[PDB]
Write a structure and sequence with these properties.
Chain B: It is found in: Host cytoplasm; Host nucleus; Host mitochondrion. The structure holds two protein chains of two kinds. By secondary structure, chain A is mostly helical. Chain A has one domain. In chain A, 69% of the residues lie in helices and 0% in strands. The longest helix of chain A is centred in the N-terminal third of the chain and has 23 residues. By secondary structure, chain B is mainly alpha-helical. Chain B is 62% helix and 0% strand. Chain B contains one helix and no strands. The longest helix of chain B is centred in the middle third of the chain and has 16 residues. Chains A and B meet through α2, α3 and α4 of A and α1 of B.
């Protein structure tokens, strides 16, 4: 159920990323079927915004690098992510991962490929629980990250 | 069948740009 916490973190982050640009999307399971999801969201959001300003300084906006189809999406996610983390995991890399994930969702809605949002969420969840969890647990878990953004 | 090399290059390129912008602590 450490996996579930990672899933709900992903679900809330994407929900707000889309909510704030006028598309509604909700995949939380907390019920029906200051919570970790909410507080991690806020840090992820602040740390990802610092990222973006840095990024966009120097480079074109990431949405223009995607190319954007229901066929290409899996390859796109997998190629960038594996590239990002190939020689290691750290907090800023994890921050960029989530930021990257977010613009993919945002672009998917843009490109009238809304359902892709749901694929990206579950790709992000399983990448976390398969490849990022151990490192995060070893570095004080998510609680250590939120406290860096107090 | 198929992703164009042209698009694959862009993802490679995107990944490296991302990595160059990472601060370790966040």
């Amino acid at each position: 159920r450490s996996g579930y916490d990672n899933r709900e973190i992903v679900m809330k982050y994407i929900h707000y990323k889309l909510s704030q640009r006028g598309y509604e999307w909700d995949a939380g399971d907390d019920a029906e079927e200051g919570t970790e999801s909410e507080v991690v969201h806020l840090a992820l959001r602040q740390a990802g915004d610092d990222f973006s300003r840095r990024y966009r300084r120097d480079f074109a906006e990431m949405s223009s690098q995607l190319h954007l189809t229901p066929f290409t999406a899996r390859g796109c996610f997998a190629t960038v992510v594996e590239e990002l983390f190939r020689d290691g995991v750290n907090w800023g890399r994890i921050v960029a991962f989530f930021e990257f994930g977010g613009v993919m969702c945002v672009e998917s809605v843009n490109r009238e490929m809304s359902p892709l949002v749901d694929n990206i969420a579950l790709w992000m969840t399983e990448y976390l629980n398969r490849h990022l969890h151990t490192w995060i647990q070893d570095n004080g878990g998510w609680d250590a990250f939120v406290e860096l953004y107090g | 069948e198929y992703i164009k090399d042209c698009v694959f290059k862009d993802w490679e390129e995107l990944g490296e740009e991302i990595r160059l912008k990472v601060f370790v602590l966040g």
